[PDB]
Design a protein around this ligand. Sequence first.
Ligand SMILES: [Cl-]
Length: 168
Amino acid sequence: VNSFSGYLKLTDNVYIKNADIVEEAKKVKPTVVVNAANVYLKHGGGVAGALNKATNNAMQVESDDYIATNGPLKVGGSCVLSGHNLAKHCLHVVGPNVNKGEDIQLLKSAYENFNQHEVLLAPLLSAGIFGADPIHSLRVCVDTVRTNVYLAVFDKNLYDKLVSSFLE
Ligand SMILES: [Cl-]
């Protein structure tokens, strides 16, 4: 388990790779994979949809059962559900959706969820459909997360921008 290879160490506890999170989960066998969740755990798009498709919809079936009994998450919150075939656990984390007017401040709360897990495979929170500046997201990750985080960024141009930004 947790066989991370070819990462670039940014800080003592934050690592980055130009890779697909689904392919990483299959290769690494992480204890924890982070999902870029929404409050209703509806995994139709973005990273959530890629993770769910890689579980052959088992993540969505479990999520729908969870929500019907347990209610929604909060923005900046998390829950731990099964990792199915991808990981032991999936930490579903809700970053703010700034495209929909949610407070970017909540990205700090979102990343604080990572500190309950010693090592995580994760995407950049509030990227993509959530609309936040990826350079900002990496800074909040570095400033907030104290446990070991392995970030997978699949877009090569974005990866290059993040690494260039970080090394300034
Ligand atoms: Cl390195």
